[PDB]
Design a binder for these strands. Structure first.
Lengths: 98, 96, 151, 114, 127, 206, 79
RNA sequence: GCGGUCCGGCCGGGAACUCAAAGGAGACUGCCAGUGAUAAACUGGAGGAAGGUGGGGAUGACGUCAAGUCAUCAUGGCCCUUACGACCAGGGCUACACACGUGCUACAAUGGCGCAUACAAAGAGAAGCGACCUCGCGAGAGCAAGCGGACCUCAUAAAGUGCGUCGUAGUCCGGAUUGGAGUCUGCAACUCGACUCCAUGAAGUCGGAAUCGCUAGUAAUCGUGGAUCAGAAUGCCACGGU
């Protein structure tokens, strides 16, 4: 009924933010479906490190995308409420849309 | 990196939308299977630099027409410049 | 390989008759890794080897092989600016091992019209030993032994 | 089985042989055997002079044989006489279709010498 | 009662169910040879049964996907044996000598930055 | 020229990011350029302020920014004077509101960018560079610290020869991922070219 | 084979092919649109094109209905 | 293992299995034996999913070459300055008697081409991927559903396997090239793009001197995505079959 794709870059921060949305939903509301890991999108970028020529040098970089599902089965006026406003934690993304 | 070559894109950007795109849409339904009247491919004499390709994308801190990535916007050397100091979020040395 | 003396990678036996040696060959013949199309011309080129020779089958390969198994060879060296190449007996495992490289090498040249055939005519050319392999078992028997004075 | 052009292409399958003429390729090697009531894997080793004289009147549509030898040549001289570029090459010994030439470009030049 | 084991190999993971019936088998809902049971991977699947008895003693429902042929078949052989333990640990003892228990570490090596592919080093001039 | 950046490699551990936020390709660059656009300016206005680090975090269409310094006092003004003007402009770049942190720095003797800048000025102030580095190291060991090492490069004290002197003391495991090492460049322009000062300060275990 | 469906030319040049059939064809033309094709409404025209240095004169003959207006203006000079 | 099927995990349903992602456990020569001082260690064995730094990254010391980079950029000094600056259009860098280098494709039957059909991993996506139906032989064009995405699209992967053509013959190989006829993005493709389609078919029938890579899931062979990008990769980066 209410999906909640929470995504971030640090593994021990994406499921420490989920560890909240849940301890809140399973508070002012209920149901919930426990956290669901989801595949991780690791996007690498291989670049040349020498300011000039020297191709075989290169510095390989990558950004990791961690996901969470949450997925609340039984919404709540009290839960869809406090849901908004309070959220804190800078650096994570939230998406509940359909 | 030649203030001039820089402004060349800024003019190709400020001119690509305030004109092209806005009225450049005059080549879709218009310039297609609609039937022919000459009204079409004709009033084609707007700017020049204003184009969806008339650009090279250049580092926001230098202007190196090569090794420029969108995802970060900057150019490889300026990228690493950041990288090694947090600078680019959740970005670190890859390995596997 | 300098200080580290290794060993050998005993490969999986055959997928029909069940045999090591048998296998090695199958690979020897394989190229570009098409082990399928390879063994597809292995047993198929061995079907008519169980017909023309007649001698059983499981050994219709072995016996014919014994005709390409040398006991001595050569080897380049360099002592003071020459070669002083001194022969030597081929290890029990390297012996027949070589045998296969050649037997097939004769199939790599014998340009007929079909591989499986460019294979048997030689394996059978081992029953009465006279192929480019059994005679190849002479280029070493003649080359070596001539410079045997150093053995 | 001379047919159409003096060329006497034979001792080859249907869809096969046919492509021996100057102007006959794979594509137009079935576009005709599929509009004359003829098969494909058929060897002329059983072709009555009847199922052929009908395959002979077919090629009579698109320029082939000598007709095409000077048909394309017609444009050959043309494009040249014009005095453009795409013609320049031919009257020189250099690749027409914009190919580079800092090196390789032999197919439209000739075996190196010096 | 149902019998099973996982077993996988080089990106080819499989699930194997033993059902005390017949040598007959149905991997991924489609008979043996009706899939690949004849290619290089011929009796490869039987192998884990060589050192034992079957033919019409035990049926089995297989399931695998992902990777390649000989790879999948491998997992198969893996599941089969790590599923055949159920009868006892006494057979897995004599079934290890066939190293069927061993999970194949072997895997495609990553192509480093510099070579044409994994180990292939691009040819450089004389000197 | 063959050593990896100490900080940037430890990023997966001990040393955290300096830019903590998240976005999508669609506007990841416009943010990156947005971010490192505030730093450039904020640092300038605080030169004589003894800064050393500027952490930026974007909490969904917003911004915080934590300014580090052992010299915080005169970075705020008369009870909020200075800091104010800053936030003002700060916000006026990206397009979203702004707030700003104020992180002190007890003991600048051990902070990278500080000891590194604590010299780039020394040099332009035509002082004995070989006295700057000897200084650093010592009064760096003085108050704790397990390892510390300073490096300088370019026309030293006047020359046409490009030399680079170093000076370590203590213990610095630059190769041990889990070791806490703070490193920071610090350029200084003089009357005859640019000079380079790159410090390294080892502090802990796990 | 290139311009999808329907050729292409200039505008600051069209007032010279149309204005060359009513006022009598005058001296060669001097624009910079080799990119244009050869419309039968040019036949004979005194056409020229600046290619690096000067404008090379040519005569829009007969059968040349579908070809550019630059192929006849080599810029690279050798020998 | 369960019930309902318009047999599509399709719908109840079920958390077992695959997988997904967090936190664990495990291998240390630890055990036995041999050689080796009763040492270190190497060899062999047991158990073990994995041994003997399990495989693979990342990591590259004091230093050498006043190496390379002052066109990434910053920078001492120097020089120009109604100027080597700067605005615009066209054109070269994609020119070419040539030698060299790294490459893609071949020189074929362990292979071409036709039909049938079975198995990847990895990655990207909205000023984007764009089903399905629909127009062409085809590249595409129309209608436009879905997807900021383990939900949809980009891909029906290739070798491969079962018959079928062929017969070892420059040939049903190989694809340069030239013309004609068409497709796509763009202000605009002639000098300069990319792709399809109809005709055409060299050289090369495997290579002297010499030389390069590779000791494992590696060499070789086989496809796949990605960065930049408006559009043009046999290049590069990354993936995975045998």
């Amino acid at each position: 009924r209410i999906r909640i794709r929470l995504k971030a870059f640090d593994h021990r921060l994406i499921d420490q933010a989920t560890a909240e949305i849940v301890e809140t939903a399973k508070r002012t509301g209920a149901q919930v479906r426990g956290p669901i890991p989801l595949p991780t999108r690791k996007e690498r970028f291989t670049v040349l490190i020498s300011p000039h020529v020297n191709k075989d040098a290169r510095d390989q970089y990558e950004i990791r995308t961690h996901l969470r599902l949450v997925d609340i089965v039984e919404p709540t006026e009290k839960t869809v409420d406090a849901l908004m406003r309070l959220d804190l934690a800078a650096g994570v993304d939230v998406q509940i849309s359909l | 990196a030649k203030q001039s070559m820089k402004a060349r894109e800024v003019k190709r950007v400020a001119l690509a939308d305030k004109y092209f795109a806005k009225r450049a849409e005059l080549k879709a339904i218009i310039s297609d299977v609609n039937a022919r009247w000459n009204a079409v491919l004709k009033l084609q004499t707007l700017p020049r630099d204003s184009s969806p390709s008339r650009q090279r994308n250049r580092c926001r801190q230098t202007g190196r027409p090569h090794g420029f990535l969108r995802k970060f916007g900057l150019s490889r050397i300026k990228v690493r410049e950041a990288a090694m100091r947090g600078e680019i979020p959740g970005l670190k040395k890859a390995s596997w | 390989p300098r200080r580290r003396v290794i060993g050998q990678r005993k490969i999986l036996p055959d997928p029909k008759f069940g045999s090591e040696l048998l296998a090695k060959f199958v690979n020897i013949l394989m190229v570009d890794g098409k082990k399928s199309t390879a063994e597809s011309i292995v047993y198929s080129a061995l079907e008519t080897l169980a017909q023309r020779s007649g001698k059983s089958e499981l050994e219709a390969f072995e016996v014919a092989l014994e005709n390409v198994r040398p006991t001595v060879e050569v080897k380049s060296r360099r002592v003071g600016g020459s070669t002083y190449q001194v022969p030597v007996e081929v290890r029990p495992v390297r012996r027949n091992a070589l045998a296969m490289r050649w037997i097939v090498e004769a199939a790599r040249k014998r340009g007929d019209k079909s591989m499986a055939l460019r294979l048997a005519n030689e394996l059978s050319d081992a029953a009465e030993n006279k192929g480019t392999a059994v005679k190849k078992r002479e280029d070493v028997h003649r080359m070596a032994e001539a410079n045997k004075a150093f053995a | 089985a001379r047919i159409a052009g003096i060329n006497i292409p034979d001792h080859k399958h249907a869809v096969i042989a046919l492509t021996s003429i100057y102007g006959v390729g794979k594509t137009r090697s079935k576009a005709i055997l599929a509009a004359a009531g003829i098969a494909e894997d058929v060897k002329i080793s059983e072709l009555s002079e009847g199922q052929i004289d009908t395959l002979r009147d077919e090629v009579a549509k698109f320029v082939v044989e000598g007709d095409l030898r000077r048909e394309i040549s017609m444009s050959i001289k043309r494009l040249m006489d014009l005095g453009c570029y795409r013609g320049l090459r031919h009257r020189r010994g250099l690749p027409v279709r914009g190919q580079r030439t800092k090196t390789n470009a032999r197919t439209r030049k000739g075996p190196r010498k010096p | 009662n149902q019998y099973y084991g996982t077993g996988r190999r080089k990106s080819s993971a499989a699930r194997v169910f033993i059902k005390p019936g017949n040598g007959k088998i149905v991997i991924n809902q489609r008979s043996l040879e009706q899939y690949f049971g004849r290619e290089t991977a011929r009796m490869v699947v039987r192998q884990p049964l060589e050192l034992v008895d079957m033919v019409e003693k035990l049926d089995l429902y297989i399931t695998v996907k992902g990777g390649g042929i000989s790879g999948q078949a491998g997992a198969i052989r893996h599941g089969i044996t790590r599923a055949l333990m159920e009868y006892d640990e006494s057979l897995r003892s004599e079934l290890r000598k066939a190293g069927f228990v061993t999970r194949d570490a072997r895997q495609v090596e990553r192509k480093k930055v510099g070579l044409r592919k994994a180990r292939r080093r691009p040819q450089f001039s004389k000197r | 020229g063959q050593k990896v950046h100490p900080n940037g490699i430890r990023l997966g551990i001990v040393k955290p990011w300096n830019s903590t936020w998240f976005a999508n390709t669609k506007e990841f660059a416009d943010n990156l350029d947005s971010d490192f656009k505030v730093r450039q300016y904020l640092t300038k206005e605080l030169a004589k302020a003894s800064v050393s680090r500027i952490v930026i975090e974007r909490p969904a269409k917003s911004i915080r920014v934590t300014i580090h310094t052992a010299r915080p006092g005169i970075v705020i003004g008369k009870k909020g004077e200075d800091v104010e003007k800053l936030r003002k402009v700060v916000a006026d770049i990206a397009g979203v509101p702004a707030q700003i942190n104020i992180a002190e720095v007890r003991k600048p003797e051990l902070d990278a960018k500080l000891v590194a800048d604590s010299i780039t000025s020394q040099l332009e102030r035509r002082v004995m560079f070989r006295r700057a580095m000897k200084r650093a190291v010592q009064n760096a060991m003085r108050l704790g610290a397990k390892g510390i090492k300073v490096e300088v490069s370019g026309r030293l004290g006047g020359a046409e020869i490009a030399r680079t002197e170093w000076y370590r003391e203590g213990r610095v495991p630059l190769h041990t991922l889990r070791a806490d090492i703070d490193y920071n460049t610090s350029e200084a322009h003089t009357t005859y070219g640019v000079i380079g000062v790159k410090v390294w300060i080892f502090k802990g275990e796990i | 084979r290139s311009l999808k469906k329907g050729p292409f030319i200039d505008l600051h040049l069209l007032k010279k092919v149309e204005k060359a059939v009513e006022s009598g064809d005058k001296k060669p033309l001097r624009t910079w649109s080799r990119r244009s094709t050869i419309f039968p409404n040019m036949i004979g025209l005194t056409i020229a094109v600046h290619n690096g240095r000067q404008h090379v004169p040519v005569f829009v003959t007969d059968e040349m209905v579908g070809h550019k207006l630059g192929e006849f203006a080599p810029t690279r000079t050798y020998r």
